[PDB]
Design an enzyme around this catalytic site. Structure first.
Site, PDB file in Angstrom:
ATOM      1  N   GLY A   1      31.678-100.558  76.119  1.00  0.00           N
ATOM      2  CA  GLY A   1      30.465-101.151  76.645  1.00  0.00           C
ATOM      3  C   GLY A   1      29.630-100.160  77.441  1.00  0.00           C
ATOM      4  O   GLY A   1      29.769 -98.942  77.314  1.00  0.00           O
ATOM      5  N   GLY A   2      28.758-100.706  78.289  1.00  0.00           N
ATOM      6  CA  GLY A   2      27.855 -99.874  79.062  1.00  0.00           C
ATOM      7  C   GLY A   2      28.559 -98.834  79.904  1.00  0.00           C
ATOM      8  O   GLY A   2      27.965 -97.799  80.222  1.00  0.00           O
TER       9      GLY A   2
ATOM     10  N   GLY B   1      14.012 -65.938  62.245  1.00  0.00           N
ATOM     11  CA  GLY B   1      13.884 -66.696  63.476  1.00  0.00           C
ATOM     12  C   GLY B   1      15.187 -66.891  64.216  1.00  0.00           C
ATOM     13  O   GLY B   1      15.169 -67.137  65.427  1.00  0.00           O
ATOM     14  N   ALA B   2      16.319 -66.792  63.517  1.00  0.00           N
ATOM     15  CA  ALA B   2      17.604 -66.866  64.198  1.00  0.00           C
ATOM     16  C   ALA B   2      17.749 -65.750  65.221  1.00  0.00           C
ATOM     17  O   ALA B   2      18.316 -65.965  66.297  1.00  0.00           O
ATOM     18  CB  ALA B   2      18.743 -66.815  63.183  1.00  0.00           C
TER      19      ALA B   2
END
Ligand SMILES: O=CCCCC[C@@H]1SC[C@@H]2NC(=O)N[C@@H]21
Ligand SMILES: O=CCCCC[C@@H]1SC[C@@H]2NC(=O)N[C@@H]21
Lengths: 507, 182, 179, 148, 91
Positions: free
Chosen positions: A170-171, A405-406
């Site tokens: 649950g929460g 771009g890596a």
């Protein structure tokens, strides 16, 4: 009876939690009680408890009966010391109403959190709870929110650590998600919002608790947990070890402890670790072990997104964060899970003034429709932003290929990096040599001579070195020494940025 | 300066040490570089510089000189020590930790390393073993190519090939059996 | 769509928008009708926990004026996530159809009274006492229960009062949001 | 009855405070009710009330009986305008338990005070109360401190 | 700038005026400098610069010019007005 005697009676009752039979039932499951866990975690004789006599105030469904009143109410909170450093701790007591969260439970947790934020010390939470106390209705919900807010208020101010040692549904699962690190105990802890019964009823799926939210699931599939441990005892020992690394608050520098490993120790074993042929992989963890003090490395998410490696180590006794590509898995290509795993670790390290060391060997990003449909663009932007935003010292070492771009993402010097080094096998290029030759010289028949000249001139670290993209090309054996020196110079690094409430990182 | 540290004041360390399926009670105290250790009722003194980083550690136990190596250690308590040329695995816990450990359930521990399977999708470049061949631990069994990286699969342990389920040029998938070892 | 249940994609979509609005001083208005989170193994294996924490953190962190209106059911942690007053919200309103509860009435009755045969009378009493906005209103979780027709007017008024809202927070380089 | 009808019933009960006979007793003393005072103080049509339905949570000495439950619980809080300028106001209702201060009373006052500090507007308090609600014991004390 | 003021939008002022032990119902509205006043059912118009500081105030009621003095006033509602040379106390 006199007031004193009632005091001893309440003390004795509280020390037993939910009763001896409940304690035995807990033990037969292979789990320790909350107080035993606290005793194992903290330095002997250092635990100071708070709010022993607090009791729930529910008056519905016969909850006001004396048999429903437990001093402490399913949570033990207080402060203590680990290796002499102050810490605040709460442990949930499963033997009291199944560890369900009530108003008093949340009140105690919030009190300790407020105290920790006031003095600036970390918070450790041992989670073992069924969920919200239904008898208190909306009250329980409120308490959860009261915790959540504090977590968000404490993020980046004091480190927060969660250890899931039992059921958690649950929460209640959301509070650990908001903390910096989450650890899980194998075979006795699990995390899920909805239990298996509701899953079967709604989606007609058959699954067990272990499959739905077991430690293995959250350490290998969901990327929710950072480490899984065999036992409560093993988990607590490793938790102490891990806590030794962190600073107490964001106002303090990275911890520095007594060191015996010389800072100028050579590492000749690295001179031939990288194979010449780019089609053979090696283990970056070997390099990390060789470079760090005493070959000690605390890895984070070791079994999740193995193409990248993140962890904590020490250089000359100073805590450092290690991020590195793993050529041994998927050629070391970046992807969604690895990007997220690296990004959050980098952000945490920057938030608490921990220097970063990066080892770069990356050919690019993993291709395919699965990565594109999964939003690889934003997830990779996450890691790129994490490196660009950091203001702690950043040291980068390129061992092999770094393409496209890596290369930019992996803490390139253009992201305001501090020192960038290249091994003799480094390759900084827009893309592979064959593809570059195909694009550039396509339409010319004398492809072979042009390709040979291109490989001779560009398939090496010279193009980057001549432009200053890397501070130097270093012998691998000297790596450690160099790094140590830099970490001494950069300890006083200070950078100015434009004001803002906060940035807007891609999510 | 913001938070001075408070030294944990401990005079005696009570430890449960497990050497070879036997559990020994140890009481250890120190003064400077000298450790007084009571093991099952026998008193010994150990002296050394206690340099925890050097690969070789020189100690003096009751005047007898020894050279020991610490091959590995873990937060759990496991420790591998090279002593008199032999590597012994000991498990050290505090007395309270040892007492609490009695409530821990023994795990199944069943994890067979005999079967070797494909970790990632790819194409089997070559197979270096055939049924009946001898394979040492860490010895390559087959090579799998994916994204032109020539991934290498290694034998889990020393043994023989009960069966080879893979052939060169075959597109294997993740979690696919490649070979069996006894 | 999907009964209004939260999930991974919706959580991320809401979280980033909320963070942007807060960053640039844009007030937020929320309409709450959520029964919970989408169940299944796909959501769990996808990391629903951290993605939902994203939206929860986004609401908790915001310091711009926040106005919330509950039109119908708001169950469990989903109620907390959707800018509950406990996240330092400014004004929270409930329509007459609002339902703030830990979970559905039938499940709550099953859990609480299970082991008692006279289930029907207890369930009727529970629905009469709790299947409404009164439990939240009596505790102050919602500032008021308003007629829907007045909604706009109320909101406008609040946005005029809260334009000068200013809040103090502890110093930090930045937070560590789940990713 | 439907939820709506119970809503009107609660609104009507709250608007009367402690009952019509209590209001008459208040008037014969020469004193106005809390809501009348608020109406006189604020600009017409500017009063926005907060926490109308809040009720005390005491469960001792028969305080949980329905006849001991009053929506609002002896204090009316909200905001309004004086000559067009914003202000936050609370008025104590003497007709509910003699205006004694309970947990909910202090909670409402603290809520309005926090709102006023958050936006930066003055606070006006119309005080008419016997004292602490003895039935809530230490709880009342806590509330007082929370105000202080 | 921090808090803009919101003008109280009132179209008619309903007043109880006590002159000499008698209570009169008055309904007053304004447009610019012109006040329309209904007193017990009689309509009148009052025009002036409405300079509230000058000791002497000149007004025009239905075209008839009057000079009046405001000797004192209180938040409670009391007001002393010199009109036609006589000082009247109104509430
Ligand atoms: O079949 C091989 C030809 C194309 C391989 C390109 C590799 S896949 C991993 C890396 N990421 C890219 O975008 N390209 C390289
Ligand atoms: O088949 C129906 C019984 C269970 C339905 C529960 C619903 S599914 C959407 C919402 N989220 C939850 O966790 N529970 C409710």
């Amino acid at each position: 009876t006199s007031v004193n005697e009632r005091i001893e009676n309440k003390r004795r009752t509280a020390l037993l939690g939910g009763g001896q039979r409940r304690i035995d039932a807990q033990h037969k499951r292979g789990k320790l009680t909350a107080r035993e866990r606290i005793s194992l975690l903290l330095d002997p004789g250092s635990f100071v408890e708070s709010d022993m006599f607090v009791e729930h105030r529910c008056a519905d469904f016969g909850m006001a009966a004396d048999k429903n009143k437990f001093p402490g109410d399913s949570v033990v909170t207080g402060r203590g010391r680990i290796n002499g450093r102050l810490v605040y701790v709460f442990s949930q007591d499963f033997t009291v109403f199944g560890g369900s969260l009530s108003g008093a439970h949340a009140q105690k947790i919030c009190k300790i959190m407020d105290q920790a934020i006031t003095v600036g010390a970390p918070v450790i939470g041992l989670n073992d709870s069924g969920g919200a106390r239904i008898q208190e209705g909306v009250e329980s919900l409120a308490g959860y929110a009261d915790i959540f807010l504090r977590n968000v208020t404490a993020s980046g101010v004091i480190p927060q650590i969660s250890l899931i040692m039992g059921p958690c549904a649950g929460g209640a699962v959301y509070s650990p998600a908001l903390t910096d690190f989450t650890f899980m105990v194998k075979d006795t802890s699990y995390l899920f919002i909805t239990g298996p019964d509701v899953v079967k009823s709604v989606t007609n799926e058959d699954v067990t608790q272990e499959e739905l939210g077991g430690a293995k699931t959250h350490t290998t599939m969901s990327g929710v947990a950072h480490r899984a441990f065999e036992n409560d005892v093993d988990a607590l020992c490793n938790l102490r070890d891990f806590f030794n690394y962190l600073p107490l608050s964001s106002q303090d520098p990275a911890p520095v402890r007594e060191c015996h490993d010389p800072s100028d120790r050579l590492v000749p074993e690295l001179d031939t670790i990288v194979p010449l042929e780019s089609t053979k992989a090696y283990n970056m963890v070997d390099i990390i072990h060789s470079v760090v003090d005493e070959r000690e490395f605390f890895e984070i998410m070791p079994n999740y997104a193995k193409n990248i490696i993140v962890g904590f180590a020490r250089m000359n006794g100073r805590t450092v964060g290690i991020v590195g590509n793993q050529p041994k898995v998927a050629s070391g290509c970046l992807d969604i899970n690895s990007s997220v795993k690296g990004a959050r670790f980098v952000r945490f390290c920057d938030a608490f003034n921990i220097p970063l060391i990066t080892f770069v060997d990356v050919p690019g990003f993993l291709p395919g429709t699965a990565q594109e449909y999964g939003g690889i663009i934003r997830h990779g932007a996450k890691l790129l932003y994490a490196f660009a935003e950091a203001t702690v010292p950043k040291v980068t070492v390129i061992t092999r290929k770094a393409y496209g771009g890596a290369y930019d993402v992996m803490s390139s010097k253009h992201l305001c990096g501090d020192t960038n080094y290249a091994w003799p096998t480094a390759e900084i290029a827009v893309m592979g040599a064959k593809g570059a030759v195909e694009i550039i010289f396509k339409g010319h028949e004398n492809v072979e001579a042009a390709q040979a000249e291109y490989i001779e001139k560009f398939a090496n670290p010279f193009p980057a070195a001549v432009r200053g993209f890397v501070d130097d090309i270093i012998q691998p054996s000297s790596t450690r020494a160099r790094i140590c020196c830099d970490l001494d110079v950069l300890a006083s690094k200070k950078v100015q940025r434009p004001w803002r409430k906060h940035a807007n990182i891609p999510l | 300066s913001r938070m001075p540290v408070i030294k944990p004041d401990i005079a005696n360390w009570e430890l449960s040490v497990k050497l070879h399926d036997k559990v020994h009670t140890v009481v250890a105290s120190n003064n400077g570089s000298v450790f007084s250790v009571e093991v099952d009722g026998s008193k010994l003194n150990v002296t050394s510089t206690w340099n925890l980083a050097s690969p070789l550690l020189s100690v003096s136990v009751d005047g007898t000189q020894r050279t020991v190596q610490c091959l590995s250690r873990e937060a759990g308590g496991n420790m591998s020590i090279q002593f008199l040329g032999t590597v012994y695995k000991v498990n050290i816990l505090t007395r309270l930790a040892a007492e609490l450990n009695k409530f821990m359930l023994e795990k199944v521990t069943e994890d067979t390393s005999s079967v070797l399977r494909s970790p990632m999708p790819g194409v089997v470049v070559a197979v270096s073993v055939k049924p009946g061949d001898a394979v040492a631990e860490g010895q390559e069994i087959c090579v799998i190519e994916a994204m032109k990286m020539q991934n290498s699969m290694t034998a889990g342990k020393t043994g023989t090939v009960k069966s080879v389920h893979c052939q060169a040029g075959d597109t294997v998938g993740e979690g696919d059996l490649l070979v069996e070892l006894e």
